[PDB]
């Protein structure tokens, strides 16, 4: 095996022995023994990597000055008195900004992983993403370190992933910078060791989609629902294919991806000249593409910054400094976007063009039948194909046009298999489905469930991403796990929470919540989602949201640009309920009576209060209902709330 792949397959299993010890019915040596019965993972150097992930063991292993395990040692140190309680419950990070233990659970997980390891896992050059996926499937809530004295908030999956990432980065940095006897480069003396933490061997990279909003919200046609679920998804999959293709270029693993969503993506890559040269060339090719189709509607900007491993261990809070610095470099290299010859080329092409797609408000793109271009029709095709099929394939013919001369078509799981033994250079992107284990199984997360419109933003998210937990939990590992938690919340929990509601999910992820449906249903679902979020964030993070009433058949591009305890307890629960009971008990109170009530109320005058008293007297409601209404009517806050509640009644 390629030595890089040896680092991969060994590192991602360095702390495997923990699940085995914690089992009791079943650390370095224990994990070494466990992995050592299986034909596929019968590779020996991986066994050495796993068996030697710690200082004491390495003291006597007499390994070569070049043996992959040393990088594993430094990686685990970077990612990270010692009495480990096997029953320690994992804590949610959101508090500091427990989950659901007993012995037999670990035994069951041992059974499950032996099952998958005999029947689902196999060792080849390209199966590393699959190994990562199975680790993701099985470990996301098994505590990584169960030290009684540490704030336990890292899952073993997170620890393993970040260790593998750091190991890959170290290997590239050392191999490129002409060092081979790593035992002497790193392990020899702690002062030399400390220097290695200090050398800027890492680059953090950023991405940003420029023109999200105007591309997603330029719709006027009759297939408003059908396009939007598809346009959003096309833009999302564009971001995903860009990031995957970049990772493929840099020969790095899918682990080095730390966050995707919205338009941003963060990559941790090697700090070599080779990597930087490739990054520049790839930026060139991407920008040329994006000009070659859109020219203002979509563009991508990347920037990178040198960072030293000492900064990843939260040594001086400097993680926050470097992270803000790369953010500023991105926000200030989105200024200078087009070179001189570029802007000339944009302005001097006198071309015979037809006119603006009815569905897609764009002139430059070239329309056809029904006043629609080819791209809009491909978007309509993928829209039709969304609901029934789940797997998404990157191939040379496809239906929709992808970046680096690729296309997407749609298939089913049997069809995916048939492509797999066909050995076509394919990637599978799924509809939130694990237990795939099919070729490049890439469980991409996207909330597909299927007037009122709702938009929501996390209020404290810039700080949370950036400031985080102060002074003591600011590693790469802990911000990474926080990111994963928010992402998985917005990419699974919405799907489940929205079930009992007549709503289709349009664009959800990051911190943006965009749902559209029936008036009453949108309000009820919004309240339910706010409460369920406050549950999951332990009442640490707040949401701000707006819901408006929009008539059917409006151009959805226009409705989008228009768009808690108080509302639930005071308005919906008390006033609305008593009002609904009042009208339910007494008939003949049609929209006329209610609207006369409005007519009196909105004009805030005392003579109107007397008139409203007369009207309520002429009604035939129970004395309690009339009395409550009149007492509320005497008070400004109560009367506004009453107006809102009765308006909701209609």
């Amino acid at each position: 095996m390629n030595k890089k792949n040896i680092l991969m397959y060994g590192s991602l299993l360095h702390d495997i022995g923990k699940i085995i010890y914690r089992s009791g019915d079943h650390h370095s040596k224990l994990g070494h023994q466990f992995l050592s019965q299986f034909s596929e993972f019968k590779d020996n150097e991986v066994l050495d990597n796993v068996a030697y992930h710690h200082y004491k063991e390495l003291a006597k292993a007499n390994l070569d000055n070049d043996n992959t395990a040393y990088i594993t040692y430094i990686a685990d140190n970077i990612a990270s008195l010692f009495n480990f309680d096997k029953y320690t419950p994992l804590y949610s990070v959101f508090n500091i900004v427990k989950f659901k233990y007993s012995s037999g659970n670990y035994t069951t997980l041992m059974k499950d992983m032996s099952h998958d390891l005999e029947h689902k896992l196999s060792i080849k050059e390209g199966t590393f993403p699959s190994l990562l996926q199975w680790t993701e499937s099985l470990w996301q809530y098994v505590p990584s370190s169960t030290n009684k004295n540490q704030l336990i908030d890292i899952s073993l999956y997170d620890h393993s992933r970040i260790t593998c990432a750091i190991a890959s980065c170290i290997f590239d940095y050392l191999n490129e910078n002409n060092i081979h006897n790593y035992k002497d480069e790193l392990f020899s003396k702690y002062e030399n060791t400390k220097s290695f933490y200090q050398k800027e061997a890492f680059l953090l990279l950023s991405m940003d989609m420029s023109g999200i909003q105007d591309f997603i919200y330029n719709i006027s046609g009759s297939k408003a629902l059908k396009s939007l679920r598809s346009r959003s998804f096309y833009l999302e999959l564009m971001l995903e294919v860009i990031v995957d293709q970049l990772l493929e270029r840099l020969e790095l693993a899918r682990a080095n991806l730390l966050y995707t969503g919205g338009g941003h993506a963060y990559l941790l890559v090697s700090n070599t000249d080779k990597v930087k040269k490739k990054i520049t060339q790839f930026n060139n090719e991407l920008k040329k593409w994006f000009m070659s189709e859109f020219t203002t509607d979509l563009s991508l900007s990347m920037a990178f910054e040198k960072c030293s491993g000492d900064d990843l261990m939260n040594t001086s809070g400097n993680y926050r400094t470097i992270w803000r610095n790369v953010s500023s470099k991105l926000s200030d290299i989105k200024a200078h976007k087009y070179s001189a010859e570029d802007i000339l080329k944009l302005n001097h092409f006198h071309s015979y063009g037809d006119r603006e797609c009815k569905e897609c408000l764009r002139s430059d793109i070239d329309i056809n039948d029904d006043g629609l271009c080819s791209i809009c029709e491909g978007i309509i095709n993928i829209s039709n194909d969304l609901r029934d099929k789940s797997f998404f394939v990157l191939s040379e013919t496809g239906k929709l046009k992808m970046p680096f001369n690729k296309f997407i078509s749609v298939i089913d799981y049997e069809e995916a298999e048939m492509l797999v033994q066909n050995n076509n250079q394919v990637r599978i992107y799924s509809k939130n489905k694990p237990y795939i284990g099919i070729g490049i199984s890439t469980n991409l997360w996207m909330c597909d469930y299927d007037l009122g419109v709702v938009r929501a933003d996390i209020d404290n998210l810039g700080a949370t991403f950036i400031s985080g937990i102060p002074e003591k939990y600011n590693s790469i590992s802990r911000t990474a796990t926080l990111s994963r938690q928010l992402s998985l919340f917005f990419k699974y929990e919405l799907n489940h929470l929205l079930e009992n509601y007549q709503i289709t999910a349009i664009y959800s992820g990051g911190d943006d919540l965009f749902l559209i449906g029936a008036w009453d249903d949108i309000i009820e679902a919004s309240i339910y989602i706010n409460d369920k979020f406050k549950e999951f964030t332990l009442d640490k993070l707040t949401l701000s949201a707006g819901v408006g009433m929009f008539s059917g058949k409006y151009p959805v591009s226009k409705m989008a640009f228009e768009t808690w305890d108080e509302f639930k307890k005071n308005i919906l629960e008390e006033k609305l309920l008593v009002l609904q009971q009042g009208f339910s008990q007494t008939d003949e109170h049609g929209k006329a009576f209610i609207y006369k009530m409005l007519a009196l109320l909105r004009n805030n005058e005392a003579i109107n209060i007397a008139r409203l008293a007369y009207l309520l007297a002429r009604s035939k409601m129970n004395e309690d209902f009339t009395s409550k209404i009149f007492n509320w009517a005497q008070n400004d806050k109560d009367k506004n709330q009453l107006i809102t509640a009765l308006e909701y009644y209609i």
Partner: protein, 192 residues
């Protein structure tokens, strides 16, 4: 090249209902006073003056969608409550909108299903401005004859919805015609 200005005020003889909300009536989202859109005036005037007969219809309002392009020669703006109607209604304490209850009778069943339609109050006054871009000297007499006949027709017709059912009758008072650009005389042109 001169620009003729046709300004005046219109009274709501019988209740008016434009009802862009529906059944509300069009308003301004802050002042909460009703308005009468220019699109309504222009559309009803065009329909009447065309049904009266063409080239003149193209000339006054402009179509530019039939393989030849003609620029609009009459510009119609919205109208608003005058200060006079506002002060009068305030002093005498009259609301700005009336709401009429209506009803429908089924046949073979004779069950009544009621309606609720909002209507602008009788006596309200709207102030309007028209503009006439005289692009040809030798046609102003003809074009004001046409606009005269159009206003005469609108006097005897309705604006908005439900006019067959008895609402929308308007009146035109206090029309003055002044030349505000150029050196064209307008002391002979006439509109009731």
């Amino acid at each position: 090249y001169s620009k003729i200005k046709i300004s005046g005020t219109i009274e709501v003889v019988t209740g008016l209902h434009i009802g862009g909300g529906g059944s509300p009536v069009v308003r301004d989202l802050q002042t909460k006073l009703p308005i009468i859109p220019g699109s309504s005036i222009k559309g009803k005037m065009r329909n009447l003056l065309a049904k009266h007969f063409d080239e003149r219809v193209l000339r006054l309002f402009g179509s530019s969608e039939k393989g030849n392009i003609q620029r609009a020669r009459l510009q119609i703006s919205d109208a608003f409550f005058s200060e006079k109607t506002k002060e009068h209604f305030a002093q005498n304490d009259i609301a700005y909108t009336e709401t009429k209850f209506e009803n429908t009778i089924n046949r073979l069943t004779a069950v009544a299903n009621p309606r609720q339609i909002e209507r602008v109050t009788r006596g309200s006054e709207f102030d309007f401005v028209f503009i006439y871009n005289v692009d040809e000297e030798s046609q102003v007499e003809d074009d004001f004859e046409n606009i005269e006949k159009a206003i005469h027709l609108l006097e005897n017709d309705y604006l908005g919805g439900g006019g067959t059912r008895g609402n929308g009758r308007i009146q035109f008072k206090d029309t003055n015609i002044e030349t505000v650009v150029g050196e064209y005389d307008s002391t002979n042109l006439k509109i009731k």
